[PDB]
Design a binder for this molecule. Structure first.
Ligand SMILES: COC(=O)c1cccc(-c2cc3c(=O)[nH]ccc3o2)c1
Ligand SMILES: COC(=O)c1cccc(-c2cc3c(=O)[nH]ccc3o2)c1
Ligand SMILES: COC(=O)c1cccc(-c2cc3c(=O)[nH]ccc3o2)c1
Ligand SMILES: COC(=O)c1cccc(-c2cc3c(=O)[nH]ccc3o2)c1
Lengths: 120, 115, 121, 119
């Protein structure tokens, strides 16, 4: 299922546990950006997905502060887990930096990450 | 300034505690479409007038309903006399692969401390 | 009344547009933000026969941020709908992609939302 | 290197012309290419891109109305062209439907498309 170690297409490492209560907890390590070492993540997932072949909806957040760096920013990933022979988590993400009001129009980056259990 | 009750432009209510460790926890009640929410925020933001970056997730399942979907809000808290949490959001539904191209809605919500 | 006219967004940008009978949007865009100066060409499309059930009119347009004065090596697309009424409005979300190397492509695209009115706020 | 026919990951086709002035014009259609599936597209691209290895920024719009059907919606693609033997147009898109105000919160889908010169 969702619990395990995942890697995105750029080599980031997503170590997650899906708890009985719909909780996602774990750590995220980024290969890009103002990042170093592991960061805390928390999120939620549908603990009772449909039984018609649909994926499992989920999302999580990382605030880019730890004991070694603070980028004053946070990313959220929204997506779905798709089980099968090669399990996959397909996501789109929003990355918001803290800004002044005058710069808020350019505060948010958008992209897409796909995660598998094998390094790219 | 984050802990407390917040209201968006469409009648939803966002009840949150900002923990000392960077955790966001609380409940969300929606007027469109109570649920658990969790997320994270920058616990040491800049002190130069910049906002505080944050994000959170709600999976739309509780003891009464299940929409097989989840929303993430990404944004910043801005303090002052008219404090705001300004966000953009992504809402992904569980779909088949053939319907995955239309699985994700995008929008924006502004939250205030007064209805 | 209609899409054709001069519009302003919440940040002071000026959107001068003509909606042709064939579904074409043409005109100029002037930005109050970013690496921008003077007017830029825009082109886009809109639904020339919208639903009659109270729904808005879908549309979209693109500006590449190159003119005779500057070139930011970037382009914005706005996707949204025109809502008629006593205070006509075009509500949009936008994507702004800059030309980047492959190593920087992950951070090439900004996202936001602009609301346009025929009265300057 | 933009002018020509491009194919996305899900069986859609477009034939675009990139004009000297920055114009994108053409037709967006399905894999089969029957008339009911063809729509006008228009957009813009950076006609003087950087020469440091960066991609070429561009965008375009299709409103989903033709002489045969009307979905009351429009998609914009925003992205960059990357040349070479394995040329690509890498995009993210927004698809907005005309809605009432009460339904406007759910009017916009988001996704991503990658286009190649080979099916
Ligand atoms: C402005 O960006 C930053 O301040 C920053 C700092 C550290 C890491 C990241 C990062 C990693 C990552 C990823 O793996 N997938 C999607 C987004 C994303 O963003 C961003
Ligand atoms: C398939 O189910 C849904 O799409 C669904 C179900 C229940 C609630 C929501 C909901 C509430 C809400 C909000 O307040 N702000 C931004 C997004 C958003 O989405 C969505
Ligand atoms: C990275 O950004 C740029 O290179 C750049 C250059 C010139 C103008 C803009 C600009 C103006 C504008 C607007 O009015 N609404 C939404 C987006 C937006 O973007 C962006
Ligand atoms: C179903 O209702 C719609 O709004 C509609 C109708 C027809 C075609 C499309 C279409 C094709 C296409 C594509 O190739 N890439 C990204 C988006 C996208 O959207 C959407």
């Amino acid at each position: 299922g969702i619990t395990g170690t995942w890697y995105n297409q750029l080599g980031s490492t997503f170590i997650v546990t899906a708890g009985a209560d719909g909780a996602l907890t774990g750590t995220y390590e980024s290969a890009v950006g103002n990042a170093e070492s592991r960061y805390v993540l928390t999120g939620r997932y549908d603990s009772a997905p449909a039984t018609d072949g649909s994926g499992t909806a989920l999302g999580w957040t990382v605030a880019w502060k730890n004991n070694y760096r603070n980028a004053h920013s946070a990313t959220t990933w929204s997506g779905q887990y798709v089980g099968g022979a090669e399990a996959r988590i397909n996501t789109q993400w929003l990355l918001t930096s803290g800004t002044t009001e005058a710069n808020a129009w350019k505060s948010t980056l958008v992209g897409h990450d796909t995660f598998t259990k094998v390094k790219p």
